[PDB]
Each structure stands twice: as structure tokens, then as C-alpha cells.
A = this chain, B = another copy of it.
């Protein structure tokens, strides 16, 4: 998986990755916060745009790119945030929400 990281990172350092990330973060917190109703939408989009440019790529490599853009977006958001008071009793829904989104990337 190592060599795979050096492949997706090379394409993520391009202007293209910047645009996608902007749309992923712009929609992720569009309404004003994290919308699970878009989580699966953004993930499916990124994998679609990137998957269309590299159809001969492997499901793995393409996957590493989808997560690279997703994190890059949400991450850029926290940079400004301050992380107030979060309840650990939410991790359950958080892990479930993400686990369900993956279902949209594979189908």
C-alpha cells in the first residue's frame, strides 16, 4: 500500500484535487455543519471524478485518493474551528455513518 500512497499523493498535489476538496468541504458544512445526508454523496462524487480520469487504476489506489480529498477538506475546516464540547457518546453514530457511506462508493 506504500507505493500506492506515493501515487495518489502525486495527483492530489494538483489543482484538480484542490477543486474537489473545495466542493467536498463546501457541501460538508454548507448548511452550517456536518450533514450525513451528504457524506455518502461527497464520497461517491470524489471517487467518480477521480475514477473517470483513471479508469485503469486499481480500486485500492482510487480509494486512497477519495479519502485523501475528504480528509483534506474536513481538516481545512477544523483549522478555523475550535472544537468546543464533544460527547464521546457520538462516536457510535460517527463510525456508523462513515461505514454506511462506503456502501455508496462500492454501490
Number of copies: 2
Contacts of A99 in B (CB 8 A): 5, 9, 12-13, 68, 72
Q: Please give the number of chain A residues whose Cβ is less than 8 angstroms from any Cβ of chain B in the complex.
A: 57
Minimal Cβ-Cβ distance residue in B for A29: B83
Q: Which of B5, B80, B107 contacts A102 (CB 8 A)?
A: B5
A52 interfacial contact with B, CB 8 Å: no
Contact: A21 with B102, CB < 8 Å? no
Contact with B along A11-33 (1 / 0, CB 8 A): 01100011001100110010011
If the complex has contacts A86-B25, A87-B80, A95-B17, are A75 and B32 also in contact, measured as CB distance less than 8 A?
no
If the complex has contacts A12-B99, A74-B74, A106-B1, are A91 and B29 also in contact, measured as CB distance less than 8 A?
no
